Amino acid sequence: GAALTEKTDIFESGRNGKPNKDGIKSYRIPALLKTDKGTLIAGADERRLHSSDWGDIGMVIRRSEDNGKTWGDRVTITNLRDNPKASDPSIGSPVNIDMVLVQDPETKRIFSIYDMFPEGKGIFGMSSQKEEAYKKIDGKTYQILYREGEKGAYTIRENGTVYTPDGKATDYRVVVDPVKPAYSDKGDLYKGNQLLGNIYFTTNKTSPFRIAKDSYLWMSYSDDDGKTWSAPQDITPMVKADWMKFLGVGPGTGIVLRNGPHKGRILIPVYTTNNVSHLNGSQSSRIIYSDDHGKTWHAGEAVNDNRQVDGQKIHSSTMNNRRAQNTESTVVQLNNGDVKLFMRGLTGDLQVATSKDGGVTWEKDIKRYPQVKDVYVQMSAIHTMHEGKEYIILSNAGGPKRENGMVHLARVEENGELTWLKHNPIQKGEFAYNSLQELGNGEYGILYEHTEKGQNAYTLSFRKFNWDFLSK
Amino acid sequence: GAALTEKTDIFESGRNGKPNKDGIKSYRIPALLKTDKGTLIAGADERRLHSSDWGDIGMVIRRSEDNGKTWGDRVTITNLRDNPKASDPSIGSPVNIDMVLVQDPETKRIFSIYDMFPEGKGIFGMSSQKEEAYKKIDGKTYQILYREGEKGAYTIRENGTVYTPDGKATDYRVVVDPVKPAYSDKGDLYKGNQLLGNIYFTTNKTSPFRIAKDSYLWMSYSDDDGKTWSAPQDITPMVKADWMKFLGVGPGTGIVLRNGPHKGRILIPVYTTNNVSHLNGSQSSRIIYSDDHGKTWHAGEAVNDNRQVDGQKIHSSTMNNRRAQNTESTVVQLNNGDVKLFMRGLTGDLQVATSKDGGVTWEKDIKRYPQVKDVYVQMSAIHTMHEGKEYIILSNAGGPKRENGMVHLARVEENGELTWLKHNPIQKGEFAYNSLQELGNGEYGILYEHTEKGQNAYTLSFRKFNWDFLSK
Ligand SMILES: CCOCCn1cc(CSC[C@@H](O)[C@@H](O)[C@@H]2O[C@H](C(=O)O)C[C@H](O)[C@H]2NC(C)=O)nn1
Ligand SMILES: CCOCCn1cc(CSC[C@@H](O)[C@@H](O)[C@@H]2O[C@H](C(=O)O)C[C@H](O)[C@H]2NC(C)=O)nn1
Ligand SMILES: [Ca+2]
Ligand SMILES: [Ca+2]
Ligand SMILES: [Cl-]
Ligand SMILES: [Cl-]
Ligand SMILES: [Cl-]
Ligand SMILES: [Cl-]
């Protein structure tokens, strides 16, 4: 008997192009996480001014201590302050966008990894020319600041003190230890005790310094079941290669590997572009990972690294092949130790990559499943055991557009092949991003993007699952 | 008063398309070095089968213990063995091409740094897709091998033993410590005691393994005034970034900095291309350098890194601007500590970059001197003192084509500005690459490319001249 709850709204978009009660026009990019304590953390983009992938965006969560009925109030993880002098407020703020949640099972620490850009249009406003973002000086890596009319790289060193290109301390300093709510002060630029501006501002600046215009990866963590969160840490220099243009998360929920020689590794879906073809032919999925409980991070190789396409090998740093792209992804570990990566792409059906070494490298062939539609939108997938049998549940739009959210059920064969045991609809109308979690006791939950009644894209809602609804 | 000696031919090409008496069709790419012992070392590419920038090419030198009057026998530094199964022998050999010579004045070690490519057409045969060439495994960097029909990266580890992608030793091993004359055995691929093939072969292979198809940088060294040479060392992983396509030397003779805080630093001119525009818009000069007497090498930044061209900043890794290219270069240190980089380019006149920090970074604006033409060909320049005043001597083709060799004398003014005083012909007819050295007692030597009497491109000849010839 399909025991599906009714659409329960977690983040409420405005209506008919108008702000909602709190002044927030739009919400997007769901992430759903069940912690050890049992609580559910629903995370999202709080897009205050419009639905687009830039602007004034906060990383926020709400928690439910009762498995999905009472969702508490908003906790803001990060929300950088807007440029008060921007001529166009809609592109007038440093950007945070797209989250992945995961928890370490030993330390219980919870992680939010999300994109950051300086002021502008984010992934759609990236420059054609590289600016160096970091400099290693006597074994230490520092973030670079550029000053108008000077070519050299200033650096942000100890306690935020700004140093000249030649290595001499100055009177300028950056707030590297933010203290205000939502860490709205991160990046503020002081001269002495006087606030001048912010290193993330790119127009009508009131201070002399800015970071490189580039794509960055930030992380925040909570040690009290997601009630309070650390200041953001810039993990970009640990994982971003010198050729990468864009580097960002596949939004959703990561995993911790539960078996095999790499047990305890945290996996975070990400994807890159290169400077050869950027968003037109190089978007490429991979993971980043931590083996030390989130203290340090490393990049896996891309699925597209040394992949054969139409008889010729490509590489994510050099490819120019619109159809060979794979972008946002969701990652699952099997019981045979294998890692499966389900990747948004442009074949029309579901693409899946397999790694035998814990997500670092990927096997030759991308498996395509026409049994599952992919209309080129984010998806989520989780592992679950039922009656001693191993399964995967994957949720995404059924089509033809971002509409008709379906839930697809597969049995995991011994050798890791997937057998799709039919697909049951879960939401009609508009259906876009989504995030699944196993709730335990034969149950499943989902936080997803959906609109009706002229709601602004999107309102994020929660439904519930029973094992019987999945099958038949 | 003015004295120019007569053309003494050091490396003699064949005539009318035919091999010379030794079976060599072509010589190219002079480097000239006066050692501490007084010896002159003349280096060149020995291009057996033809004049093009690929094929069977050896790195060779001759030595003159009498200031350029008589010359000893050819000494071969490196000459990789041909692929005996190649269909076209003219592109059928692993390639060494273009050397920079320099001597460490403290240790007396003499270095030859030169390009390397696997079998093919060198810089003109580079693939559009990147193949990873190196893998770091628990802090140790190993060269990658690719195996027929398999995607993963093997590694060449201790004693040349080949390891599987999964990390298990195999019965295959690479000759990493070559022993034959000219180190023709380097890269040989053995299984057990049976020679199967060579990892630098790329066609009609008899072994299963090859290195990444890419551009490499190698170094060989002599401790006995150039009579004997170490086995080649692969210095690529020390200096080549992950975005770089081509990375190679600007051939000629490097320098050791004689004053300032980086005295003793070895500088080697090099240039790169990127994957965005490669040879059509991205050639970019820089130096590599050693602070530990040649044991380890580092890349400086490109002249074109964060350069403004028509109001827009570029980077060597993303540029696509034919006119902003700078390629092969020759490097000089002034008495005020500054480094000057004279760069082959496409403005028609001489382009000069300046570094204040020992070659690591370059000042904003590239100086052009219309008094010295540049017809897009290599050049050489050296520092020199005369009767207490500071000069630079620079030699290149006078034009309109690669013809009419000139020597240009410039006075180094107070501030490091250059004043071009004289321009004197040194060789009528064809004239291309060249390499200058001070011989002492007010005299100078030059090794250069020229043809006459139906000689194949080129014969490398040597003249000596004196201050009156220069200053006239
Ligand atoms: C006809 C010209 O042929 C070119 C074809 N083409 C393909 C593309 C590419 S997509 C790259 C997308 O994954 C990316 O923008 C994501 O999109 C989201 C979505 O709702 O789809 C929402 C999400 O917040 C956003 N994440 C960021 C960091 O912005 N642009 N043009
Ligand atoms: C209208 C025609 O349009 C084509 C324009 N064009 C010109 C380019 C290329 S230059 C790259 C050259 O520096 C390079 O080959 C060097 O050249 C030498 C030379 O005699 O010039 C000799 C030297 O050994 C060689 N070294 C190597 C590693 O190959 N790419 N496009
Ligand atoms: Ca904001
Ligand atoms: Ca050879
Ligand atoms: Cl500012
Ligand atoms: Cl000989
Ligand atoms: Cl072979
Ligand atoms: Cl000194």
Coordinates of all heavy atoms in Angstrom, one line a residue, chain A residues 3 37 42 52 67-68 86 91 128 132 136 176 191 206 249 282 287 289 317 336 365 385 426 428 436:
Chain A
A3 N 2.3 4.4 0.8 CA 2.1 5.3 1.9 C 3.1 6.4 1.6 O 4.2 6.5 2.1 CB 2.5 4.6 3.3
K37 N 22.0 11.4 15.1 CA 21.0 11.7 16.2 C 19.5 11.5 15.6 O 18.6 11.4 16.4 CB 21.0 13.1 16.7 CG 22.4 13.6 17.3 CD 22.7 12.9 18.6 CE 24.0 13.3 19.3 NZ 25.2 13.1 18.5
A42 N 17.5 19.9 6.0 CA 17.2 20.3 4.7 C 17.9 21.6 4.4 O 17.7 22.6 5.1 CB 15.7 20.5 4.5
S52 N 17.8 33.2 -10.7 CA 19.0 32.8 -11.5 C 20.2 32.4 -10.6 O 20.2 32.5 -9.4 CB 19.3 34.0 -12.4 OG 18.4 34.2 -13.4
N67 N 11.6 13.4 12.2 CA 11.5 12.6 10.9 C 10.6 13.2 9.9 O 10.0 12.5 9.1 CB 11.1 11.2 11.2 CG 11.5 10.2 10.1 OD1 10.6 9.7 9.4 ND2 12.8 10.1 9.8
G68 N 10.4 14.5 9.8 CA 9.8 15.2 8.7 C 8.4 15.9 8.9 O 7.8 16.2 7.9
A86 N 26.9 48.6 -5.9 CA 26.7 48.0 -7.2 C 25.5 48.7 -7.9 O 24.5 49.0 -7.3 CB 26.3 46.5 -7.1
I91 N 23.1 41.5 -9.8 CA 24.4 40.9 -9.9 C 25.4 41.6 -9.0 O 26.6 41.6 -9.4 CB 24.8 40.9 -11.4 CG1 24.9 42.4 -11.9 CG2 23.8 40.2 -12.3 CD1 25.7 42.6 -13.2
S128 N 37.4 35.1 -19.9 CA 38.1 34.3 -20.8 C 39.6 34.1 -20.4 O 40.2 33.1 -20.9 CB 38.0 34.9 -22.2 OG 38.9 36.0 -22.4
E132 N 45.7 34.2 -11.7 CA 46.2 33.4 -10.6 C 45.5 33.8 -9.3 O 45.4 35.0 -9.0 CB 47.7 33.5 -10.4 CG 48.6 33.0 -11.6 CD 48.6 31.5 -11.7 OE1 48.2 30.8 -10.7 OE2 48.8 31.0 -12.9
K136 N 52.3 30.3 -3.5 CA 53.0 29.6 -2.5 C 54.3 30.3 -2.2 O 55.1 30.5 -3.1 CB 53.3 28.1 -2.9 CG 53.8 27.2 -1.8 CD 53.8 25.7 -2.1 CE 53.8 24.9 -0.8 NZ 54.5 23.5 -0.9
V176 N 39.6 37.4 7.9 CA 39.7 36.0 7.6 C 39.0 35.2 8.7 O 38.9 34.0 8.5 CB 41.1 35.6 7.4 CG1 41.8 36.4 6.2 CG2 42.0 35.8 8.7
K191 N 41.8 49.2 6.6 CA 43.1 49.9 6.8 C 43.2 50.4 8.2 O 42.5 51.2 8.6 CB 43.3 51.0 5.8 CG 44.8 51.6 5.8 CD 44.9 52.6 4.7 CE 46.4 53.0 4.4 NZ 47.1 53.4 5.7
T206 N 35.3 50.5 -3.0 CA 35.8 51.5 -2.1 C 37.1 51.2 -1.4 O 37.7 52.0 -0.7 CB 34.7 51.7 -1.0 OG1 34.4 50.5 -0.4 CG2 33.4 52.3 -1.6
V249 N 30.3 21.9 -7.2 CA 29.7 20.7 -6.7 C 28.6 20.2 -7.6 O 27.9 21.0 -8.2 CB 29.1 20.8 -5.2 CG1 30.3 21.2 -4.3 CG2 28.1 21.9 -5.1
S282 N 33.1 20.9 -22.3 CA 34.0 20.3 -21.4 C 33.5 20.0 -20.0 O 34.3 19.3 -19.2 CB 35.3 21.2 -21.2 OG 35.0 22.4 -20.4
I287 N 34.8 13.2 -8.4 CA 34.6 13.5 -7.0 C 35.9 14.1 -6.5 O 37.0 14.1 -7.0 CB 34.2 12.2 -6.2 CG1 35.2 11.1 -6.4 CG2 32.8 11.8 -6.5 CD1 36.5 11.2 -5.5
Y289 N 37.5 14.1 -2.3 CA 37.4 13.2 -1.2 C 38.4 13.5 0.0 O 39.4 14.1 -0.3 CB 37.6 11.7 -1.6 CG 39.0 11.5 -2.0 CD1 40.0 11.1 -1.1 CD2 39.4 11.6 -3.4 CE1 41.3 10.9 -1.5 CE2 40.8 11.4 -3.7 CZ 41.7 11.0 -2.8 OH 43.0 10.8 -3.1
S317 N 40.7 18.2 -19.3 CA 41.3 19.5 -19.4 C 41.4 20.0 -20.9 O 41.7 21.2 -21.1 CB 42.7 19.5 -18.8 OG 43.6 18.9 -19.7
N336 N 30.0 -4.6 -3.1 CA 31.2 -5.2 -3.6 C 32.3 -4.2 -3.6 O 33.4 -4.4 -4.2 CB 31.0 -5.7 -5.0 CG 30.6 -4.6 -6.0 OD1 30.6 -3.4 -5.6 ND2 30.3 -4.9 -7.2
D365 N 34.1 2.4 -19.5 CA 32.8 2.6 -20.2 C 31.8 3.2 -19.3 O 31.7 2.9 -18.1 CB 32.3 1.3 -20.7 CG 33.1 0.6 -21.8 OD1 33.5 1.4 -22.7 OD2 33.4 -0.6 -21.6
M385 N 19.3 -1.5 1.6 CA 19.2 -2.9 1.7 C 17.7 -3.2 2.1 O 17.2 -2.6 3.1 CB 20.1 -3.5 2.7 CG 21.6 -3.4 2.3 SD 22.0 -4.3 0.8 CE 21.5 -6.0 1.2
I426 N 6.0 10.3 -8.6 CA 5.9 10.9 -7.3 C 5.5 12.3 -7.2 O 5.2 12.9 -6.2 CB 7.3 10.7 -6.6 CG1 7.2 11.1 -5.1 CG2 8.4 11.5 -7.3 CD1 8.3 10.5 -4.2
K428 N 3.6 15.5 -10.0 CA 3.2 15.9 -11.3 C 3.5 17.4 -11.4 O 3.8 18.1 -10.5 CB 1.8 15.6 -11.5 CG 1.4 14.2 -11.6 CD 0.0 13.9 -12.0 CE -0.4 12.4 -12.0 NZ -1.8 12.1 -12.4
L436 N 17.4 12.5 -2.1 CA 16.8 11.3 -1.4 C 17.6 11.0 -0.1 O 18.8 11.3 -0.1 CB 16.8 10.1 -2.3 CG 15.9 10.0 -3.5 CD1 16.4 8.9 -4.4 CD2 14.5 9.7 -3.0

